[PDB]
Design a protein around this ligand. Sequence first.
Ligand code: FAD
Ligand code: FMN
Length: 601
Amino acid sequence: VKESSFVEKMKKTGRNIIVFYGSQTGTAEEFANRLSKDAHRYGMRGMSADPEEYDLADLSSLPEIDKSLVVFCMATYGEGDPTDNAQDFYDWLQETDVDLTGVKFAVFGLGNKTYEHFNAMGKYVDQRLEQLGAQRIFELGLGDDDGNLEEDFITWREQFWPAVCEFFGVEARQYELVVHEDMDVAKVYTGEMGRLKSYENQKPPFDAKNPFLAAVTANRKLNQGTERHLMHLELDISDSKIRYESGDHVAVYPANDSALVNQIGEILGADLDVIMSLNNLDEESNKKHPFPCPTTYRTALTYYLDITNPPRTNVLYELAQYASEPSEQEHLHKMASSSGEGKELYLSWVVEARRHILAILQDYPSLRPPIDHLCELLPRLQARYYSIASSSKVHPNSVHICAVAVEYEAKSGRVNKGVATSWLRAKEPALVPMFVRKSQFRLPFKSTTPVIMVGPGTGIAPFMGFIQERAWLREQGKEVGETLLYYGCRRSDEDYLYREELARFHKDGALTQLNVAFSREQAHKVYVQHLLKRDREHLWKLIHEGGAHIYVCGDARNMAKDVQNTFYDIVAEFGPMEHTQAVDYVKKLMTKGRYSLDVWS
Ligand SMILES: Cc1cc2nc3c(=O)[nH]c(=O)nc-3n(C[C@H](O)[C@H](O)[C@H](O)COP(=O)(O)OP(=O)(O)OC[C@H]3O[C@@H](n4cnc5c(N)ncnc54)[C@H](O)[C@@H]3O)c2cc1C
Ligand SMILES: Cc1cc2nc3c(=O)[nH]c(=O)nc-3n(C[C@H](O)[C@H](O)[C@H](O)COP(=O)(O)O)c2cc1C
């Protein structure tokens, strides 16, 4: 059920600039919001909208508004596909014939070079609209998350507005605090995501808005060493009605470290246990609150807000008014610079030093902002995803998670800890709000199809699922093909994940070949690519004659692309080909669903 034409919403609300956002983990939204807040005191007036709830065909009616401009802040996910919320826009856009002549636009893509289809989504919207007759007002920004998406945006945004002012010639808070002294507690959100008492009155089906509360059945340390901590949790989804398959992902809604929460209240001299509400007061908007209200400051900072990731430019700039010392006040105002020492200090003192909000406050004694303004500026705490480590056919009422607990010492001088991983780490077998989202990472249909799994480190997660299901089919008497696991870890006795289980699978015929590279047991580093190169001739027979499927799960920055280069080589060698010939052959494998990835950062 979608909303009424945004064109009418604009005409009725006196706005001319509308900014849609294709976002998954809320970054494109954070930008869309900042951009539509720029116009407000730059001559014009805009609004950020979710394309998933509007009919984008109404773009043709956009030019009915004088000086109209539409901006798209799109993120690309997977294999250059759109984000969930931008899916319907994508497909409409893809095969529509609506003449958008008169429509003015500007697009900002959010991507990451470590992936192949860099800003594939952004580039599409940009090229497409123009083909439909619309005119580009400003060049397509191509932000890169590998470097610094924040600085790419600050830069584009810096040239965008001046361009919008020339063409159009104009030449030129967001929330209210309502403390609720008198109010029943059963009307206060205690950190569910959907409706009130949803974590209590649990009703299927469960999803992003209505996450199920699975209780931790098991939580064991897979880690045999001590240097790191790798864990294995078994979540119970007994009567959730939830359906999952090997290769699917499971999101989890974490809770900020309470200790960090109480300190923010302390240093800021704020009472956290204050039932309150931040009403968006532009009375005519469907975005009434920044996060579920009414609720306390404590509940907000703990389940709804992001208090760990380094702050972005806009929040540092707004809090600058709260610095009593001019010296510090100016540093906050300068970190917003797209160049110069202000830009230098941001990347060093914040991004690189991994200074979260609390740190900034401790390292800048002047900063004593109001907690309500802080809760407005702070981005929302997102859910972390984990490749399911079990098979629905052997564990239908349980979702297994394999994860390495993040924790390191930052240049800020403080020990930072992973939000979800610390959380999950402490979950003594204790509910966990989760949901499940389908992927394309799947085993082949014909059990006879051989599979080559390359998963070093925690990238073995989805493979425990594939292996359980692969052995299960063998119990059914079905004819299973070769199942090869190319795993990798540091030292045999430090972090060999599922050593015992894998061994059991190998001898039971389930796991055809258990190939493990121990990168630190010798002087030279042995990696899974070396084992791949070692078995090149056989690998080629499977890939070339058996129609084998390859699955590379894990690190996206290095491992994934290194493994690709090896397959390019194996191909270029066993079927006489020049380099370039082999790369197209391999990419053609990805086209037919023969080479599947499940990488991250
Ligand atoms: C599709 C998908 C599947 C995933 N599957 C798995 C999985 O199976 N197993 C698994 O463990 N993870 C997996 N992840 C990663 C997982 O979602 C989380 O990123 C991870 O669990 C850490 O989250 P966190 O909340 O603990 O840490 P956060 O609080 O989010 O902190 C993480 C951030 O800290 C920074 N960082 C980390 N170490 C350092 C350092 N030493 N120096 C500087 N900066 C640093 C980086 O910004 C990193 O993203 C997956 C991600 C995706 C997209
Ligand atoms: C699983 C995953 C897949 C991604 N796939 C791509 C991709 O195909 N191409 C690209 O340019 N960026 C890709 N990215 C990067 C995101 O687009 C980038 O982080 C962006 O800032 C996300 O914005 P959001 O927070 O609005 O989703 C991917 C990120 C993840 C985690």
